[PDB]
Design a binder for this molecule. Structure first.
Ligand SMILES: *C\C=C(C)/C=C/C=C(C)/C=C/C1=C(C)CCCC1(C)C
Ligand SMILES: CCCCCCCCCCCCCCCC(=O)O
Ligand SMILES: CCCCCCCCCCCCCCCC(=O)O
Ligand SMILES: CCCCCCCCCCCCCCCC
Ligand SMILES: CCCCCCCCC
Ligand SMILES: [Ca+2]
Ligand SMILES: [Cl-]
Ligand SMILES: [Cl-]
Ligand SMILES: [Cl-]
Ligand SMILES: [Mg+2]
Ligand code: NA
Length: 238
């Protein structure tokens, strides 16, 4: 795989996991330090939610870097590497990102429950796809998981967007900027999975790990930088 076997254990993808670990850790500490001076009760909630996103991802990347939670899955005569920590990371961090958006839009708890429930289902069925032993099963789960993602993104772009507009231009402009980023960046994840080792196998584990790392840092640290710079986080939350 494209990369460099940093720990001398046969895994060139640790170069990218290590860089990912460091960027997530720096993002976490930067948010933490800037949050210590925040006193507004609403801004403190956004900070609390948002620091945990790269913070949890830091733990997951450190675990992958050291090889904890790595195993192999046999599909016919090939053996695919599966890092479990990647899916546990996304299981926790994607609801937290969705919670940031839902706080900005100020939508009700049943809407939030639907959004995070479909999101959880997306991650779980992706994991089932990653562990499945026939190509037909792996592509079928991927398709179902992708449908779940489309549902989540549809709700953001319609119901939450409409709610956010009623909160005024600072909230609506921040919501719209973050949602523009999410609609593009989250969609990149199923594309990479199906062209990478889990799917068609055009891209190998090295390039795949590099690109997931770039997506992850952007989706977590980049997202948080745009959010936490905005005056919208001072507005009332429920
Ligand atoms: C770490 C932060 C984020 C926003 C991670 C997002 C991950 C996804 C949107 C993954 C989606 C998948 C789909 C829709 C299909 C099955 C395979 C995936 C789990 C990669
Ligand atoms: C390589 C980048 C590809 C990006 C493709 C982005 C397509 C996102 C589609 C998600 C569903 C959008 C739901 C409706 C959105 C809207 O009403 O504007
Ligand atoms: C360590 C982060 C690397 C990846 C970061 C990708 C996203 C760039 C973040 C800088 C955004 C610049 C300031 C906010 C811009 C805006 O409001 O849209
Ligand atoms: C002989 C090993 C040298 C390997 C050099 C790695 C490529 C340069 C590092 C660039 C990593 C950029 C990551 C993107 C950050 C979002
Ligand atoms: C031959 C295996 C079929 C895989 C199960 C179907 C998954 C339903 C979405
Ligand atoms: Ca306030
Ligand atoms: Cl403040
Ligand atoms: Cl206050
Ligand atoms: Cl590769
Ligand atoms: Mg309130
Ligand atoms: Na290594």
């Amino acid at each position: 795989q494209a990369g460099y076997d940093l720990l001398g254990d046969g895994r060139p993808e640790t170069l990218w996991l290590g860089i990912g670990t460091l960027l997530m850790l720096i993002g976490t500490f930067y948010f933490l330090v800037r949050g210590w001076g925040v006193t507004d009760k609403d801004a403190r909630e956004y900070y609390a939610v948002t620091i945990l996103v790269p913070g949890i991802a830091s733990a997951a990347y450190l675990s992958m870097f050291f090889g904890i939670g790595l195993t192999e899955v046999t599909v016919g005569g090939e053996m695919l590497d599966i890092y479990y920590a990647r899916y546990a990371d996304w299981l926790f961090t994607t609801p937290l990102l969705l919670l940031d958006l839902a706080l900005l839009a100020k939508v009700d708890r049943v809407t939030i429950g639907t959004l995070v429930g479909v999101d959880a289902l997306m991650i779980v069925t992706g994991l089932i796809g990653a562990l499945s032993h026939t190509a037909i099963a792996r592509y079928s789960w991927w398709l179902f998981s992708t449908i779940c993602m489309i549902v989540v993104l549809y709700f953001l772009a319609t119901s939450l967007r409409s709610a956010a507009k009623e909160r005024g231009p600072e909230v609506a402009s921040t919501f719209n900027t973050l949602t523009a980023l999410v609609l593009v960046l989250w969609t990149a994840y199923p594309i990479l999975w199906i062209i990478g080792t889990e799917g068609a196998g055009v891209v190998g584990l090295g390039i795949e790990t590099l690109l997931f790392m770039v997506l992850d840092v952007t989706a977590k640290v980049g997202f948080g930088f745009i959010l936490l710079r905005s005056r919208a986080i001072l507005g009332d939350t429920e």
